[PDB]
Each structure stands twice: as structure tokens, then as C-alpha cells.
Design a protein around this ligand. Structure first.
Ligand SMILES: CCCCCCCCCCCCCCCCCC(=O)OC[C@H](COP(=O)([O-])OCC(O)COP(=O)([O-])OC[C@@H](COC(=O)CCCCCCCCCCCCCCCCC)OC(=O)CCCCCCCCCCCCCCCCC)OC(=O)CCCCCCCCCCCCCCCCC
Ligand code: BCL
Ligand code: BCL
Ligand code: BCL
Ligand code: BCL
Ligand SMILES: CC[C@H]1c2cc3[nH]c4c(c3C)C(=O)[C@H](C(=O)OC)c4c3nc(cc4[nH]c(cc(n2)[C@@H]1C)c(C(C)=O)c4C)[C@@H](C)[C@@H]3CCC(=O)OC/C=C(\C)CCC[C@H](C)CCC[C@H](C)CCCC(C)C
Ligand SMILES: CC[C@H]1c2cc3[nH]c4c(c3C)C(=O)[C@H](C(=O)OC)c4c3nc(cc4[nH]c(cc(n2)[C@@H]1C)c(C(C)=O)c4C)[C@@H](C)[C@@H]3CCC(=O)OC/C=C(\C)CCC[C@H](C)CCC[C@H](C)CCCC(C)C
Ligand SMILES: COC1=C(OC)C(=O)C(C/C=C(\C)CC/C=C(\C)CC/C=C(\C)CC/C=C(\C)CC/C=C(\C)CC/C=C(\C)CC/C=C(\C)CC/C=C(\C)CC/C=C(\C)CCC=C(C)C)=C(C)C1=O
Ligand SMILES: COC(C)(C)C/C=C/C(C)=C/C=C/C(C)=C/C=C/C(C)=C\C=C\C=C(C)\C=C\C=C(/C)CC/C=C(\C)CCC=C(C)C
Ligand SMILES: [Fe+3]
Lengths: 302, 281, 236
């Protein structure tokens, strides 16, 4: 048996790391948290510090409000019975206002009002967090890649519960807050639009989802395959190529006759993933607004 | 035909079979014994799909489709025109996948690196064999396997899933979707991280892995590390597929009713199995 | 209709994206060459990308790719066939010369620095605060080779400061000198450290470092390359 490098053989610890400073307002960083030996076998053992600050607190508060709001409703339905609340936890559900109410904020609480409230919070929670991943990169002087990639995920999210419902004409077309509940919504959505397997953007989204799993499986296995030459130190290998980058590239060139570079493979990676929700959002936006039945559409493209 | 830094690596050695008979390259491709084997299986298999096209009466890629034997044939052999060709092609498919894996192992021994790649690939092969071999044999007929066709194989997915109500309720299916959804998130992040550090704001110096760890700590209070993120990626991936294979190896065998009904064990737990009100009371 | 418009537009985009991606991955190793080092006739459908420049931190200068590709070292290999596509044989000692699985790259002969400009890797005896916090501490254990013979003892652990990671094990040989062994190539056991890629008689051959409290990228590559190469050549 030769070492595979999935788990560390020995852990080493030193003073807690307070991280780089740059233009970060150090007054907003908490203090180092404890060290996790459990986590240290797979990766870093240090927990914290963390940077809060205005936007950070707004989201975390706004986020919990979205969380509690839903939870209030779950208890209502469970009749404040702890045993009931547990037995039917996956069954509860906060549905949006009925079709009748259209897109007004007039619907009564027990008919869609709480939904509109819970949504409003999640809407503030998410967008402020997005600004957070942008600002946190600025302070350190890094590229905005993380923020832009995350926007692609917001896209599909934004289309499912905001944009499409509006274009349709009612908060009715939105998704409900519930475990089994949103699973049924999904299955339904497909049936009502004549089978999503006929939606070309859906099939593209899947290709990228499967592709993301194939690529990360490929990329991860490779870096571990050449970690014996310091391959995970990807940044310095970009600035000064080593045997790790060479053997990594040659393995694949000899296998499929073509290859990537230490920096390049990360561009393939960010795009393969980002396209999943980019293509998805489009396929869903056009469903029910431009195309009623994808089967029919697949017969005559138009 | 060679990368600028390639020559020093092209040395003799590393082959598992045939010594040096097949130890050479063709353009950028390494051959090897298994390089020849996968070519053998692939051509043969392609030919057979072409002969399947004629019998079917069409050359349309969107219409061509090779079907497995009908259930009436159980696990026995069947006439080419009806399931035989499919059985033979699946053998060729299997023969080409394994050969490809072993060819990777050889490329591995020549370059002096670890065997992580062919190992990861083997999990995809296991998923394939679960749908055309393991499940079918456990159910008693090749008819339960999936057909080889662009759209006809999607129909199979749809009809197989619906045979159990909403397949969303298959519990191993839910776990498996979590790893797929998470793997993508992790891939987008890893990619964006490495790139925001190597391509900082215009004019600034190239950031370091320290900035990468600081960025994530500031954001979520924890950084897994450069080596950790590659271990995580390999894991989320192999796990997503390991549970995929699982959710299907148990469907049609140990469980063959509606998946949604499987969830009643939880609600029927005595303690609350009768308490009034709620959703199931 | 929109749907039909959107989907065609998407394929056009996707075609442009793959064009961008492929060229970005041509910033190293290109142009292609013949087995004799001369530029190949067919370079493929995609053209080399316009150069880009990285500004390295700590005053280390800049880097621009694609740029002049040179091994900056002698390759002790010779053809075994009159035609293209076959193995190139080692003219001397593959381990010593550094070819095949034992290859190394002429990386800068400087150490990697952390975010503050200090050497990234350091032996622990010189790292304030660092200690073994979990798992068997290897310091003090005897090192065995793939030939089941003892080649030395561990005298220290070289760690990565910013990533708090063990990267190298410092080993003392029969003559009192030390060597570095990649953490990823050894198996730490209860009462011994096993090194399967090298046999007892090959430890002295491991490339040595000049400064005794720091390794350079070039020295790391030679060390690692040499040890991995043992997997093929040390079988004897
Ligand atoms: C409708 C859908 C709308 C829904 C919204 C979802 C949007 C999601 C966007 C996801 C983008 C992820 C991109 C990853 C990336 O590179 O990020 C960093 C990249 C640079 O970040 P930075 O921190 O500013 O720079 C750091 C370094 O200075 C510089 O660092 P760098 O070198 O790493 O960055 C340079 C980067 C620059 O990045 C960009 O320029 C981004 C391009 C954005 C594309 C948006 C896609 C829209 C979908 C279209 C699909 C059509 C269907 C309808 O280069 C690229 O990656 C080029 C992209 C390749 C484009 C190929 C175009 C082909 C066109 C067809 C040609 C003809 C075909 C021939 C046959 O981000 C951006 O430039 C901003 C993107 C934000 C635009 C949002 C759109 C507005 C709404
Ligand atoms: C996993 C569960 C189901 C299944 C469910 C689905 C669903 C659901 C969808 C697909 C879709 C696809 N499936 Mg499938 N598919 C299954 C099993 C297979 C097998 C197999 C050997 O078992 C193969 C080759 C495929 C192949 C494919 C692609 C044609 C297409 C996805 C593109 C993609 O990016 O994929 C990921 C791979 C890559 C990014 C790598 C690139 C490799 C390419 C895609 C290979 C093409 C091979 C070609 C069709 C076969 C040529 C054979 C000749 C002899 C040479 N499927 C099983 C049975 N598949 C999608 C589609 O749009 O269909 C119309 C889609 O929505
Ligand atoms: C029976 C139902 C239909 C069907 C109906 C649908 C429908 C309907 C939709 C999909 C969609 C998708 N389907 Mg489908 N699908 C079917 C069958 C399949 C099969 C298969 C093998 O059979 C496959 C592989 C897929 C695959 C896919 C994906 C490619 C895609 C979703 C991407 C994604 O990552 O979303 C997950 C990612 C998001 C939702 C992003 C948004 C995340 C937000 C921003 C984060 C919120 C965070 C919260 C506030 C934080 C909490 C954190 C705390 C720490 C706890 N489907 C069947 C045929 N599918 C989606 C799509 O895009 O379609 C075009 C979609 O709408
Ligand atoms: C893409 C098409 C559909 C859709 C289809 C599906 C399908 C199909 C499945 C899911 C599943 C899930 N979906 Mg969904 N889902 C959609 C949109 C959303 C949105 C949104 C803001 O739009 C959110 C927050 C979610 C969230 C979720 C998760 C609760 C769950 C997946 C785990 C995971 O890996 O998460 C990624 C996130 C993280 C890794 C971070 C946060 C982790 C969370 C907090 C863990 C929750 C665990 C839960 C409480 C378990 C308790 C167990 C106890 C024993 C009781 N979905 C759209 C509308 N979703 C899976 C499931 O198992 O559902 C029950 C599943 O099979
Ligand atoms: C309407 C139908 C049902 C449903 C029915 C099914 C069924 C039925 C199955 C799945 C399976 C899956 N479903 Mg589903 N599923 C539904 C809805 C969803 C939703 C959603 C958001 O609604 C999601 C995310 C998913 C997600 C998933 C995945 C977890 C899983 C498939 C991946 C896999 O196994 O890869 C594994 C990878 C492979 C099989 C590929 C192996 C590749 C081989 C080895 C190599 C091929 C090489 C090629 C031929 C070479 C080309 C060479 C050329 C030179 C290019 N389903 C609905 C509710 N789902 C499948 C599963 O679990 O399978 C095990 C499965 O059978
Ligand atoms: C290509 C698109 C893919 C993608 C990308 C993506 N996601 C992202 C990003 C990117 C690039 C981020 O930068 C962002 C991030 O910051 O990640 C770490 C994020 C993110 N993706 C997330 C989720 C997510 N992404 C998903 C999907 C995807 N993300 C796609 C696969 C899904 C699915 C599959 O449905 C989910 C659920 C979030 C975890 C995170 C953004 C966090 C956010 O928006 O937060 C708002 C804050 C709250 C809601 C706070 C309250 C949370 C809970 C109610 C309480 C429990 C936790 C709390 C910490 C407890 C505190 C207890 C106290 C006692 C201390
Ligand atoms: C952890 C599992 C993940 C994974 C990993 C993975 N895939 C891999 C590897 C790894 C680690 C490789 O090393 C290998 C590779 O070399 O990639 C570049 C590969 C690979 N993954 C591939 C595909 C693939 N992987 C998939 C998935 C996944 N791969 C998982 C998400 C999928 C999906 C989701 O559908 C597909 C299509 C191949 C491109 C490639 C392996 C290529 C190969 O083995 O080639 C030689 C074989 C042939 C030329 C075979 C032809 C055989 C027959 C003659 C004809 C075809 C018969 C087939 C039944 C037809 C099906 C038709 C469909 C319409 C139904
Ligand atoms: C940082 O490190 C890393 C690298 O670089 C240092 C890398 O490059 C890569 C991987 C490289 C990439 C360039 C990523 C690209 C993106 C993908 C999505 C790749 C997967 C998708 C494909 C479509 C690949 C195409 C695959 C094949 C197999 C084409 C095969 C073509 C043929 C004509 C078949 C040849 C036939 C046979 C039988 C083989 C034997 C041949 C004989 C002649 C005998 C990774 C992961 C990495 O992490
Ligand atoms: C133990 O008890 C306590 C009290 C601690 C709390 C318990 C809480 C529990 C058990 C909570 C359980 C909640 C769950 C399981 C929630 C699950 C949600 C799921 C599965 C999916 C969510 C889908 C939602 C998406 C599609 C929503 C998108 C929303 C938008 C795009 C925003 C919409 C915006 C609107 C309506 C307008 C707002 C106003 C402006 C600014 C324009
Ligand atoms: Fe990486």
C-alpha cells in the first residue's frame, strides 16, 4: 500500500492565523475560533476569524427572519404540537397567494401574505450577501470572479420565484416553501409544460451538471495524482511551471490527445459550473410565457 | 506533435501487457496494448450499431435506437434483430470502457504519478454496469436495461421513474442530487477562487494562497485549503455517482412499490402515529 | 419565435466560448515541436493567444505567456527508431540524469514566499509555535527502504507555515548528512517510516539542498522528481 493522500498522516499546528490585511477594516473581524482536529484530517483545522460588518449583519438577520417566518407557519399547521411538528415536518408548506390575488400584496396572511413576507426577507438576505462576496474581494484586491459566478445561481433563483411569476401575472406561478412540497411543484411544472425532457435548455443544463461532476472528478484526481511534486500549490505553478503541471498535462494529452494548463483548467471549471444555472434559468423563463408545451414545440420549432 | 517540454517524459516502460510491442505513440495519443483493445471493441461496436440502423430502416441519429431483448427472453440470449445486437454491443461497450481505464493505468506508470484518475473513472463504469447488468440480472431479464438512442433512452428514464410514482421520493435519489448540486457549487467556487487570485484587479500584484484562505474566512468563517478543496471535489463527485448507482440498485428489487409510500414508516412511528391535527392526522 | 432564436444564439455563444477556452490553454507548451526540437508543420486549428503578463509579488518581477520555451537543461535521451512516435532511451542513469518519471523542471532557484514575504516552508525546529498536534509524530523514527533495509532516521518535519501542513520529512543518513523526503511519498507507521519508492542504497543519491533552513522551487522539483522516479527504476 502506497499513501494515497485523501487524509493527512500527521497534523501540525501553529499560532492562529489572522489572515492578510490589505484594505480590510480589521475592526470588523471576529477572533480566531477553536481548532478542529476532526476537520484537520481532511483540510484546514482553523475555524474563524470571520468578517461581519453592516451588509454581513443585514443578511444574517434578514436570513433568519425568512427562516423563522416559515417556521411560524409550520407550527401553526402542526397545531403547536411538538410531536406533530416532527412527524409531519417534510409535509408542511407555505404556499403563495392564490391565482385570484394576481400580483397584489393585498392577499390575506393565511392566503399568501406570510409567503410574500418570507420571500421579501429571503430577497434581502440573498442580494446583500451577494454584495458581501463582491466587497470582500475588493478589500483584498482580488478579481470579482466569485461574485459573477454567484450571480448565475441568483439568475435561476430570481427567475423561479420573481421574474417568471411577474411575466405570468401572478405570485401563483412561484415555488412553495416546503421539502416534499417543492418536489411536487417541480414534477408538476414538467407535466404542465409537456415534459421538460423536450426543452432543449433543460437538456443542456443537465449536460453541464453531469459535466461538472466529470470535470471536478477529473481535476481533483489529477491534482492528487501529482501532489507528490507539490501540485496543489496551483498559484505558484502558474507563475513558474513545474513537473506537476507538466505530468498533469501530459497524462491527459496522451489519453485524449489534448490538454489544459494550470490556470486554464480553472476557466473550464468556472464555466462548466456557471452554465448549469445560466442555461437552466433561460429554459424556465421561456416556459409558460413563450412555449406552452415543449412536445408540441419540438414538432414545429416555433 | 510534441509539447515543448514533452520529450524527456517519453521513455520506454510502464506497460502492463505485451512488454514493448505496443509501447509507442500516434500523434499525441499513447497506444499500449489496451490502446489497441479499445480500438477493437469500439470499431466492432460501431459497426454493429450501423447494421442495427439498416434493420430499423433509418440513418437518422435522432431516430436510430438499439433495444434490449423483450422480457419474454429473460436473461437468455436473443435474436440479433430483437435484442441480440444490443447484448453484443453492451459487451463491446463494457470491453472498451475497462480497456480505457487500464490504458490510463499504463500512462500513469510511465509518468510516475498516482492512480487517482483511473480509480475515479471506475466509478462511472460501475454506474453503467448497474443499469445494463447488475440491476437486470437481479430483476430477471435484460428487458429492464436502457436502450441506446438519443431520445429513446430519455423515454426510458421517464417511464422507469414514473413506474414508481414521483421518483423524487426515492431516498437515495435525494442524497445523490445533493452531492450533484453541491459538487457544482464547489467547482464554481474553486474555479472562481484560483482565478480571482491569479487575475487580481488591474495593476495589482498576483495574490497568494494566503489571500485565498483569508477571503473565504472573511466570507464564511472557514477555508478548507488548497489541498482540501481537491480532496472535497474528488469526494463530492464519486459520492454523487455512488448514490446514483444505489438509488437504482434498490428500485425494482428490494422495493418495487410507490416511492412516496416508503415514507410512511416515519409518520407511523407509535409515539405520534395517531396524535390528531397536522398533515397526516 | 424567441425559443428558436434563443437556442441558436446560445450555440453561437458556446462556439465562441470554447474558442476562448482552448486558446487560453495554449499559453504553455506551444508551439508544438518535432522530436528534434524544431517547430512542427501542423500546429492545429487554433492560433496562439496574445501574451498576458502576471506581476509577481515581493518584487520577484513579471511573467509573460506565451513566451520563449526552453528546457534550459540537457536531456540524456536518444531515439530507438528511425521514425516518429517511439520511446526515447536514457543514455546514462535515468535517476541521476533526471528523465522519464524522474524528470524535474528548471524552476526558479528561489523559495516560495508567503503573503508577508517570508519563506513558505521551514523546518519545524525553526518554526515558532509549530508542533505535532495529531497522528503519530515521525521525528525519531527509523526510515526503511523498499528493499526492507534501514536507510536512516527522521530528525525533523518541514512545514508549510500559511497552510499549516507537513510537506517534507528531514532524514539523517549513515554518514551524518540529511535529505528531504516528500510527505506524499512515505508511509508513517507505528514504529517506522516506510519509503516504498526507494531502496536503502538510493537515499544518498537524493539531491541535496544548499541552505540548511530553506528549499527552493528548483530543489523541490529535483528532490520530488528523483523519488518518484524510483518507482520505475528502483525495481532492481
Ligand atoms: C441572458 C442571461 C443573463 C443572466 C445573468 C447571468 C450572468 C452570469 C455571468 C457569469 C459570468 C462568469 C464569467 C467568469 C469570469 O470570467 O468572471 C470574471 C470577469 C472579470 O472579473 P474582474 O474582477 O472584473 O477582472 C479580473 C481581471 O482583471 C480579469 O480577469 P479574467 O482574465 O479572468 O477575466 C476576463 C474575462 C472577461 O469576462 C467577460 O468578459 C465575461 C463575459 C460575460 C458573458 C455573459 C454571458 C451571457 C449569456 C449569453 C448566452 C446567450 C443566450 C441568450 O474573459 C472571459 O472569461 C471571456 C468570456 C468568453 C466570452 C466568449 C464570447 C463569444 C461571443 C461570440 C463570438 C462569435 C462566435 C464565433 C463563431 O467578470 C466580468 O467581466 C463581468 C461579468 C458580469 C456581466 C454580467 C452580465 C450583466 C447582467
Ligand atoms: C444517467 C441516467 C440516464 C441518462 C440520462 C440522461 C438525461 C436525463 C439527459 C441525458 C443526456 C445525454 N446523455 Mg445520458 N443517460 C444515461 C446514460 C448515458 C450513456 C451510457 C454509456 O450509459 C451515454 C453515452 C449518455 C449520453 C448522453 C449525452 C448524449 C447527452 C448528454 C450530454 C452531456 O453533456 O453528457 C455529460 C458528458 C460530457 C459533458 C462529456 C462529453 C461526452 C459526450 C456527451 C458523449 C457523446 C456520445 C454520443 C452520443 C455517443 C456516440 C457513440 C458512437 C458509437 C461514437 N447517457 C442514463 C441511462 N442523459 C442529456 C440530453 O440533452 O439528451 C438529449 C439529458 O438531458
Ligand atoms: C419530474 C420533473 C422533471 C424535471 C423538472 C425540472 C424542473 C421544473 C427544473 C429542473 C431543473 C434542473 N434539472 Mg430536472 N427534471 C427532471 C429530470 C432530471 C434529470 C434526470 C436524470 O431525470 C436530471 C439530471 C435533471 C437535472 C436538472 C438540472 C440540470 C437543473 C437544475 C440545476 C441546479 O443546479 O439547480 C439547483 C440550483 C439552484 C436552484 C440555484 C439557486 C440557489 C439559491 C440562490 C440559493 C439559496 C440559498 C439559501 C437562501 C441558503 C441556505 C443556506 C444556509 C446555510 C442553510 N433533471 C424531470 C423530467 N428540472 C431546473 C432548471 O434550471 O431547469 C431548466 C428547474 O427549474
Ligand atoms: C432545481 C429544481 C427544483 C428543485 C429540485 C430539487 C430536487 C429534485 C431535490 C432537491 C433537494 C433539495 N433542495 Mg431543491 N429544488 C429547487 C430549488 C431550491 C431552492 C431555491 C432557493 O430555489 C432551495 C434552498 C432548495 C433546497 C434544497 C435542499 C433542501 C435539498 C438539497 C440538499 C443540497 O444538496 O443542498 C445544497 C445546499 C447545501 C450543501 C448547503 C445547505 C444545506 C441544507 C441546509 C441541508 C438541509 C437538510 C435537511 C433539513 C435534512 C434534515 C434531516 C433530518 C433527519 C430531518 N431547492 C428547484 C425549484 N431539490 C433534494 C432533497 O433531498 O430534497 C428533499 C432533492 O432530491
Ligand atoms: C421523470 C423521471 C424521474 C427520474 C428518474 C431517474 C431514473 C430512472 C434514473 C435517474 C438517475 C439520476 N437522476 Mg433522476 N429522475 C427525476 C428527476 C431528477 C432531478 C430533478 C431536479 O427533478 C435530478 C437532479 C435528478 C438526478 C439524477 C442523477 C442523480 C442520477 C443520474 C446521474 C448518474 O447516475 O450518472 C452516472 C453516470 C453514468 C451512467 C455514465 C457512465 C459513463 C460511461 C462509463 C462512459 C460512456 C462513454 C461514451 C459512450 C464514450 C463516448 C466517446 C466519444 C469519443 C466522445 N433526477 C424524475 C423525477 N433518475 C439515474 C441513476 O441513478 O443511475 C444510476 C437513473 O437510472
Ligand atoms: C453554478 C451555480 C451553482 C452555485 C454557485 C454558488 N453558490 C454560492 C456561490 C456560488 C458561486 C457563492 O459565492 C455563495 C457562497 O458564499 O458560498 C460559500 C453561494 C451560496 N450558495 C448557497 C446555497 C445553494 N447553492 C445552490 C446551488 C448552486 N450554487 C449551483 C449548483 C443550492 C441548491 C443546489 O439548491 C443551494 C441551497 C448558499 C449556502 C450560499 C449563499 C449564502 C446566502 O445567500 O446567505 C444568506 C444568508 C442566510 C440565509 C443566513 C441564515 C441561514 C439559516 C437560516 C440558519 C442556519 C445557518 C446559520 C449559519 C446558523 C447560525 C447559528 C448561530 C447559533 C451562530
Ligand atoms: C465520478 C463519476 C463521474 C465521471 C468521471 C470520469 N469520466 C471519465 C473519467 C472520469 C474520472 C475519465 O478518465 C474518462 C476520460 O478520459 O475523460 C476525458 C471519462 C469519460 N467519461 C465519459 C463520458 C461520461 N461520463 C459521465 C459521467 C461521469 N464521469 C461522472 C459524473 C457521463 C454522463 C453523466 O452521462 C458521460 C457521457 C467519456 C467521454 C470518457 C471516457 C471515454 C472512453 O472510455 O472512451 C473509449 C470508449 C469508446 C470509444 C466506446 C464506444 C463503445 C461502443 C462501440 C458505442 C457506444 C455504446 C454506448 C452504450 C452508447 C450510448 C448512447 C446513448 C445515446 C444512450
Ligand atoms: C491542472 O491540471 C489539469 C490539466 O493540465 C495540467 C488538464 O489538462 C486536465 C483535463 C483537461 C482538459 C483540457 C479539460 C477539458 C474539458 C473537458 C470537458 C474534457 C472532457 C470531454 C471531452 C469531450 C474529451 C474528448 C474525449 C475523447 C476520449 C476523445 C477521443 C478521440 C478519439 C479519436 C478516440 C481515440 C481512440 C482510441 C481507441 C484510443 C487509442 C488510439 C489508437 C490509435 C490505438 C485536468 C482535469 C487537470 O486537472
Ligand atoms: C425548530 O423551530 C425554529 C423556531 C428554530 C425554526 C424552525 C424552522 C424551520 C423548521 C424551517 C423550515 C424551512 C424550510 C424547510 C424551507 C425550504 C425552502 C425550499 C426547499 C425551497 C425554496 C424555493 C424558493 C425559491 C424558488 C424562492 C425564490 C424567491 C425569490 C426570487 C424572491 C421573490 C420575491 C418577492 C415575492 C417580492 C419581495 C419584494 C421586493 C423587494 C421586490
Ligand atoms: Fe485546482
Amino acid at each position: 500500500a502506497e499513501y494515497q493522500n485523501i487524509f493527512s498522516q500527521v497534523q501540525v499546528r501553529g499560532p492562529a492565523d489572522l489572515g492578510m490585511l490589505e484594505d480590510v477594516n480589521l475592526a470588523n473581524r471576529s477572533g480566531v475560533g477553536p481548532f478542529s482536529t476532526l476537520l484537520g484530517w481532511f483540510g484546514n483545522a482553523q475555524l474563524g476569524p470571520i468578517y461581519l460588518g453592516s451588509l454581513g449583519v443585514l443578511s444574517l438577520f434578514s436570513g433568519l427572519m425568512w427562516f423563522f417566518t416559515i417556521g411560524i407557519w409550520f407550527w401553526y399547521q402542526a397545531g403547536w404540537n411538538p410531536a406533530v411538528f416532527l412527524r409531519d415536518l417534510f409535509f408542511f408548506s407555505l404556499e403563495p397567494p392564490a391565482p385570484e390575488y394576481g400580483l397584489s400584496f393585498a392577499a390575506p396572511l393565511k392566503e399568501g401574505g406570510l409567503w410574500l413576507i418570507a420571500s421579501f426577507f429571503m430577497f434581502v438576505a440573498v442580494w446583500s450577501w451577494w454584495g458581501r462576496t463582491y466587497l470582500r474581494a475588493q478589500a483584498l484586491g482580488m478579481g470579482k470572479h466569485t461574485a459573477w459566478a454567484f450571480l448565475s445561481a441568483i439568475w435561476l433563483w430570481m427567475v423561479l420565484g420573481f421574474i417568471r411569476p411577474i411575466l405570468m401575472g401572478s405570485w401563483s406561478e412561484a415555488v412553495p416553501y416546503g421539502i416534499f412540497s417543492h418536489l411536487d411543484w417541480t414534477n408538476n411544472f414538467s407535466l404542465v409544460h409537456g415534459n421538460l425532457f423536450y426543452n432543449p435548455f433543460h437538456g443542456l443544463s443537465i449536460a453541464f451538471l453531469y459535466g461538472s461532476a466529470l470535470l471536478f472528478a477529473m481535476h481533483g484526481a489529477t491534482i492528487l495524482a501529482v501532489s507528490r511534486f507539490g501540485g496543489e500549490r496551483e498559484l505558484e505553478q502558474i507563475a513558474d511551471r513545474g513537473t506537476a503541471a507538466e505530468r498533469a498535462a501530459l497524462f491527459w494529452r496522451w489519453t485524449m490527445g489534448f490538454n489544459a494548463t494550470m490556470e486554464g483548467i480553472h476557466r473550464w471549471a468556472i464555466w462548466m459550473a456557471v452554465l448549469v444555472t445560466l442555461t437552466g434559468g433561460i429554459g424556465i423563463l421561456l416556459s409558460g410565457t413563450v412555449v406552452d408545451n415543449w412536445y408540441v414545440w419540438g414538432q414545429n420549432h416555433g | 506533435a510534441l509539447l515543448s517540454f514533452e520529450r524527456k517524459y517519453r521513455v520506454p516502460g510502464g506497460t502492463l501487457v505485451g512488454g514493448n510491442l505496443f509501447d509507442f505513440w500516434v500523434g499525441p495519443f499513447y497506444v499500449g496494448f489496451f490502446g489497441v483493445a479499445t480500438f477493437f471493441f469500439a470499431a466492432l461496436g460501431i459497426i454493429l450499431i450501423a447494421w442495427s440502423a439498416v434493420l430499423q430502416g433509418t440513418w437518422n441519429p435522432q431516430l436510430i435506437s438499439v433495444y434490449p431483448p423483450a422480457l419474454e427472453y429473460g436473461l437468455g440470449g436473443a435474436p440479433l434483430a430483437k435484442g441480440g445486437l444490443w447484448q453484443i454491443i453492451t459487451i463491446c461497450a463494457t470491453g472498451a470502457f475497462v480497456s480505457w481505464a487500464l490504458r490510463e493505468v499504463e500512462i500513469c506508470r510511465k509518468l510516475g504519478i498516482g492512480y487517482h484518475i483511473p480509480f475515479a473513472f471506475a466509478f462511472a463504469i460501475l454506474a453503467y454496469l448497474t443499469l445494463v447488468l447488475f440491476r437486470p440480472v437481479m430483476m430477471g431479464a435484460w428487458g429492464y436495461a436502457f436502450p441506446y438512442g438519443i431520445w429513446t433512452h430519455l423515454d426510458w428514464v421517464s417511464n422507469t421513474g414514473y413506474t414508481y410514482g414521483n421518483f423524487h421520493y426515492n431516498p437515495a435519489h435525494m442524497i445523490a442530487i445533493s452531492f450533484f448540486f453541491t459538487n457544482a457549487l464547489a467547482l464554481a467556487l474553486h474555479g472562481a477562487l484560483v482565478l480571482s487570485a491569479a487575475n487580481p484587479e488591474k495593476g495589482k500584484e498576483m495574490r497568494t494562497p494566503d489571500h485565498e484562505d483569508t477571503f473565504f474566512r472573511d466570507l464564511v468563517g472557514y477555508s478548507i485549503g488548497t489541498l482540501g478543496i481537491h480532496r472535497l471535489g474528488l469526494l463530492l463527485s464519486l459520492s454523487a455517482v455512488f448514490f446514483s448507482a444505489l438509488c437504482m440498485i434498490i428500485t425494482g428489487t428490494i422495493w418495487f412499490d410507490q416511492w412516496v409510500d416508503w415514507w410512511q414508516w416515519w409518520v407511523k412511528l407509535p409515539w405520534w402515529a395517531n396524535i390528531p391535527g397536522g398533515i397526516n392526522g | 419565435d424567441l425559443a428558436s432564436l434563443a437556442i441558436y444564439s446560445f450555440w453561437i455563444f458556446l462556439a465562441g466560448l470554447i474558442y476562448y477556452l482552448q486558446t487560453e490553454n495554449m499559453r504553455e507548451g506551444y508551439p508544438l515541436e518535432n522530436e528534434d526540437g524544431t517547430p512542427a508543420a501542423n500546429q492545429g486549428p487554433f492560433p496562439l493567444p496574445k501574451p498576458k503578463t502576471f506581476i509577481l509579488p515581493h518584487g520577484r518581477g513579471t511573467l509573460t505567456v506565451p513566451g520563449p520555451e526552453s528546457e534550459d537543461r540537457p536531456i540524456a535521451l536518444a531515439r530507438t527508431a528511425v521514425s516518429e512516435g517511439f520511446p526515447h532511451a536514457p543514455t546514462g542513469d535515468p535517476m541521476k540524469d533526471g528523465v522519464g518519471p524522474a524528470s524535474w523542471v528548471a524552476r526558479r532557484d528561489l523559495p516560495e514566499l508567503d503573503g508577508h514575504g517570508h519563506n513558505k516552508i521551514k523546518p519545524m525546529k525553526a518554526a515558532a509555535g509549530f508542533h505535532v498536534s495529531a497522528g503519530k509524530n515521525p521525528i525519531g523514527l527509523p526510515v526503511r527502504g523498499c528493499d526492507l533495509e534501514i536507510a536512516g532516521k527522521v530528525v525533523d518535519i518541514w512545514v508549510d507555515i500559511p497552510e499549516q501542513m507537513a510537506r517534507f520529512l528531514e532524514v539523517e543518513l549513515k554518514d551524518g548528512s540529511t535529505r528531504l523526503l516528500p510527505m506524499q511519498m512515505v508511509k508513517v507507521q507505528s514504529n517506522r517510516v516506510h519509503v516504498n519508492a526507494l531502496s536503502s542504497d538510493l537515499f544518498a543519491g537524493i539531491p541535496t539542498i544548499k541552505s540548511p533552513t530553506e528549499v527552493t522551487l528548483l530543489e523541490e522539483d529535483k528532490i520530488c522528481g528523483y523519488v518518484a522516479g524510483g518507482l520505475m527504476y528502483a525495481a532492481p
